[PDB]
Amino acid sequence: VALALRHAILPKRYGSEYKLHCEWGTYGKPEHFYTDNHLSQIGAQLGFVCHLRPFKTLNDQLFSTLPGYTGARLTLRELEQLLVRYIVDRYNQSIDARMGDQTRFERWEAGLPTVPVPIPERDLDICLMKQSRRTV
Amino acid sequence: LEKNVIATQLSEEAQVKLEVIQSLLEPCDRTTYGQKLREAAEKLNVSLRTVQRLVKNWEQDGLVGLTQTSRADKGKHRIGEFWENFITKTYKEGNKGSKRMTPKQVALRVEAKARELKDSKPPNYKTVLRVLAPILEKQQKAKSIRSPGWRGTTLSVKTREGKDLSVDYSNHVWQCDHTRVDVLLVDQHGEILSRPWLTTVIDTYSRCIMGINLGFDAPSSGVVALALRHAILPKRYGSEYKLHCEWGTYGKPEHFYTDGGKDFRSNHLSQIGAQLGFVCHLRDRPSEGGVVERPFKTLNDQLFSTLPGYTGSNVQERPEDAEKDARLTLRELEQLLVRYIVDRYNQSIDARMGDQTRFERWEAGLPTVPVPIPERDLDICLMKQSRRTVQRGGCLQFQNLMYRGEYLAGYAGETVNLRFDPRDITTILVYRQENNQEVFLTRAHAQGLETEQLALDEAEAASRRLRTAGKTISNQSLLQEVVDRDALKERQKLEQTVLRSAAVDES
DNA sequence: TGTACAGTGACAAATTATCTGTCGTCGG
DNA sequence: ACAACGACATATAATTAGTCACTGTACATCTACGATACGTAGCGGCCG
DNA sequence: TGTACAGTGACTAATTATATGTCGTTGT
Ligand SMILES: [Mg+2]
């Protein structure tokens, strides 16, 4: 969960290999974060409140169409590339009935009271995985 | 540079402060936020000003601002600088050279100076240990430092010349040095001899063991010449070795890399190297040549520590039964050690790689299959006498022995290059310089000894005895001073007899 | 980039004595 | 009138120096010395 | 019952940077 949060917060900066057309332009600290002491520390470290639906479309629009779909081979990295391409150029470019004019991304942008300032990368190190002992 | 800090093991008090801060993350209104502070002053038993300080420490540091920071004096000593420098330098001077002064002894030097200065509070011994503690840990750390290793197929061997040899393929750089084995051996009667010497020749590219010599004999340019021919030539072992794979390893190095022992930095190895066309190179430190040295720890660990008569890696680890529990002769130890090298060691995984055996990597790593050299052409191993001169009557005199040759009377007064075998000096190959090249001349023979064989150390021991006996110099006279000492024992002769019995089994 | 084998932390799987439910049996 | 920051004073555990009882490990014949090489000097025999 | 010194946990006293009140001052 902390790794998913780190990604969300930081700028994305994806490689040419994903062959994306659109930019994944979000970044930023929320006011609240809802989840399934560690996450509450992270909330207190970063300054937001921890509390304790794309899946239908990922199945229909991506995963049920892929090699090896569990009712051919596919590596984890390839699946990531497929998932990112789907997210950046299709799913976030879609318009819901409740938005009408604006896409999922555009309404996101459109609704901000202000452009947040990116959190320097180091302040998110608390999210990363850790090995506790190594010898130099 | 970047400067980040992260808190860990937060909870023990701090979880109470964390729950207070979680209750205070938003300035909701000037009316309500003050009430939230005055409520948090029930969970922490402290005033509004303590909670306002906690919120400021949190906003300026993040999670470490909840944790109590360590005092500014932590790691400083209250005794004053004079005593802190006196204690540090006293220790250091007292562990200079061979001196090994203990902290207790430093404390005695502290009480001695304090008495001279009329001080009343010379630091206590417990504080001397504390003041010297940091400079002891450093010493222990500086001994313990690990080094990584060559990783993948690329390897550059450093020489004493500061040049690095790029090791590109099998037989590009062989390496050699010697060591004692850690087992006491016995003669064929079951009496103690001595711990053999083991020599190994390794190829750097494959780390396969390309040849050995095992014996009671001393490191010598002779033992190196024998290790070289065993490495170079195609190898044959009988069924009494019970081998289940073949040591199919042979051919000639382009370079040979060694420690600075007098076996290697020698005219004899220079002449072998010039005739075989390989270049002699010097190891810059023991720690550069681990490809030679490390075969030796593996053998202690995989082979020799599991054999009777084992002596340990040093005198403080010597099994007290080693001198009573010896059982193997040199012929048994070779029959075990050769098997170990052919069936186990050359068949194990090359550790840098993880997916090849040492032999598989050698065989696949040849740039081409080399042609086996004729066993006669290994006469390049013969030692050279550079500048002896032919006497009138077609004669050469050499280590007291006098030699006669089939065309040699044609060249009285001339200078000749003599090639000889230290195992058999009865015969001399004579070469001469013509057109600034060596040309072969003749097989000179020790006159009256054509039916007889003398090794150089026998002619030498006979000459020493003959000099001190006051008798005359002649071919027989030297043979007479051999045949008594032969017929009539001394450990070196007893060792030589068991070593000979192994060489007989090689024929 | 010295080096490579044996001993040692870190993690996962199969087995068993031990802790929990549920019911039946006996005593107050 | 409410909230935040500094001046000044006051109480406090962290750090260091010191003391004390229990324990680990050396004292118990032992590495200067052996085995190679080169580099230089010498002894009498042979010749002029 | 080998034998006696240096290093080590366990506890205590002196010193100090630090946490807590209390009030004065300023911004909102
Ligand atoms: Mg050596």
Fill in the keyword field for this structure:
part of a larger assembly; 2 chains; 136 residues; mainly alpha; two-stranded parallel sheet; 2 strands; binds magnesium ion; DNA-binding
Quick recap:
Helices cover 33% and strands 4% of the residues of chain A. Chain A has five helices and two strands; from the N terminus they run αβαβααα.
Most extensive protein-chain contact, per-chain counts: A-B, 15 and 16 residues
Beta-strand segment tally of chain A: 2
Oligomer: part of a larger assembly
Q: Describe the sheet with the most strands of chain A.
A: 2 strands, parallel
The SS-based structural class of chain A is mainly alpha
Major beta sheet, strand line-up of chain A: 1-2
Give the CA-based shape of chain A. Answer: globular
Please give the count of helices of chain A: 5
Helix content of chain A: 25-40%
Portion in beta strands of chain A: under 5%
Query: Bound small molecules, which ones?
Result: magnesium ion
The gyration radius over C-alpha positions of chain A equals: 18 Å
Quote the distance from N terminus to C terminus of chain A: 30 Å
Which H/E pattern describes the elements of chain A?
HEHEHHH
PDB class: dna binding protein/rna/dna
Keywords: DNA binding protein, DNA BINDING PROTEIN-RNA-DNA complex
Entry title: V-K CAST Transpososome from Scytonema hofmanni, minor configuration
Chains A, B: TnsB
